[PDB]
UniProtKB/Swiss-Prot annotation:
Residues 2-92 form the PDZ domain. Belongs to the SHANK family. This is SH3 and multiple ankyrin repeat domains protein 3. In isoform 1, the N-terminal region preceding the ANK repeats interacts with the 6 ANK repeats in an intramolecular manner, thereby restricting access to ligands, such as SHARPIN and SPTAN1. The chain holds residues 570 to 664 of 1740 of the full protein. Major scaffold postsynaptic density protein which interacts with multiple proteins and complexes to orchestrate the dendritic spine and synapse formation, maturation and maintenance. Interconnects receptors of the postsynaptic membrane including NMDA-type and metabotropic glutamate receptors via complexes with GKAP/PSD-95 and HOMER, respectively, and the actin-based cytoskeleton. Plays a role in the structural and functional organization of the dendritic spine and synaptic junction through the interaction with Arp2/3 and WAVE1 complex as well as the promotion of the F-actin clusters.
Length: 92
């Protein structure tokens, strides 16, 4: 799916990112991407946009991140400022 987030300058998006040798990695239908959402504050910015714990990250602001490191994805979220667009799959 796809989520669209808009926040104030002095809040966050209300989610935590986790992920990991990132050259022979291999997507599966159980572990599709390197990065996934560890927690989504309930009734938070990301939540209200329909983001949930367990969502894996395919795209961030137009860039594909299936085999992209962690520091690089967090950099994409930062560059967007108060706007963020992500493509996620829910392994649920």
């Amino acid at each position: 799916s796809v989520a669209i987030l808009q926040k104030r300058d002095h809040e966050g998006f209300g989610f935590v990112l986790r992920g990991a040798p990132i050259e022979e990695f291999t997507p599966t239908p159980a572990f599709p991407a390197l990065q996934y959402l560890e927690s989504v504050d309930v009734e938070g910015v990301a939540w209200k946009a329909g983001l949930r714990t367990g969502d894996f990250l395919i795209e961030v602001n137009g860039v594909n991140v299936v085999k992209v490191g962690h520091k690089q994805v967090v950099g994409l979220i930062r560059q967007g400022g108060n706007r963020l667009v992500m493509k996620v799959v829910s392994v649920t």
